[PDB]
């Protein structure tokens, strides 16, 4: 799975 803290500016949905 992706790391959500790799870039905090990315919301895990779009």
């Amino acid at each position, epitope marked *: 799975n992706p790391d959500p803290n790799a*870039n905090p500016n990315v919301d895990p949905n779009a």
Partner: antibody, heavy 120, light 114 residues
């Protein structure tokens, strides 16, 4: 919505450089500021990010011992300080709101870049 | 690190014809359950800062022209510029934001023939 960086610099090997990134046009605490370097003729290398809200940082392992990212919330400014400079650190250093992606919107903003030359 | 490799390193294409830029990641950047690829494309001109064209491998940023389109899934990604315009001369970079450190491809220079 702007990021504006400090001007070019020359340093000698073994010194440190501190670059600033003035943010304007949005609530400074909302997003994370990143620092990306581009050695002349080379690819982009991510250095690390700071959450402006709480001040938490993440650094790339290549720089983990040598770089410090900080911010002044009242000044609306982020800083990146690179220590123990080598000729190899000659590059353009950018600050950036990299890939702000929400369900509503997507944007991405970069500073104009700060050239740093390390030389004797 | 997820290593991003582009090909070709440089490309020369006539005004109005099709330009294809390739990107390979060293591991999959796909979140399979969300069919979401953590892949982006940037355009950079000399002396200027990069500009985001595409994210989630295939979604255009607002105000990016229709002639730019991104596709692919897993480890192989393509940016296609279908009807090349003079203002498109630039270096194009892929970018993953699946895992830390964030990483970028080596760049592909797109030159114009006229």
């Amino acid at each position: 919505v702007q990021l504006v960086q400090s001007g070019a610099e020359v340093k000698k090997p073994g010194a440190s450089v501190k670059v600033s990134c003035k943010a304007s046009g949005y609530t400074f605490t909302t997003y994370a500021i990143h620092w990306v370097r581009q050695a002349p003729g080379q690819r982009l290398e991510w250095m690390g990010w700071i959450k402006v809200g709480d001040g938490n940082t993440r650094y790339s392992p290549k720089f983990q011992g040598r770089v410090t990212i900080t911010r002044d919330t009242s000044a609306s400014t982020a800083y990146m300080e690179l220590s123990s400079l080598r000729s190899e650190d000659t590059a353009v250093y950018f600050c950036a709101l990299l890939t702000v992606i929400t369900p509503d919107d997507a944007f991405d903003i970069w500073g104009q870049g700060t050239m740093v030359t390390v030389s004797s | 690190d997820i290593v991003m490799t582009q090909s070709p390193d440089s490309l020369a294409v006539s005004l109005g014809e099709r330009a294809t830029i390739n990107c390979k990641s060293s591991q999959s950047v796909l979140y399979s359950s969300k069919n979401k690829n953590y892949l982006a494309w940037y355009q950079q001109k000399p002396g200027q800062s990069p500009k985001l064209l595409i994210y989630w491998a295939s979604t255009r940023e607002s105000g990016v022209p229709d002639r730019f389109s991104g596709s692919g899934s897993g480890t192989d990604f393509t940016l296609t510029i279908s009807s090349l315009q003079a203002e498109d001369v630039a270096v194009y970079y892929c970018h993953q934001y699946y895992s830390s450190p964030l990483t970028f491809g080596g760049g592909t220079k797109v030159e114009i023939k006229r």
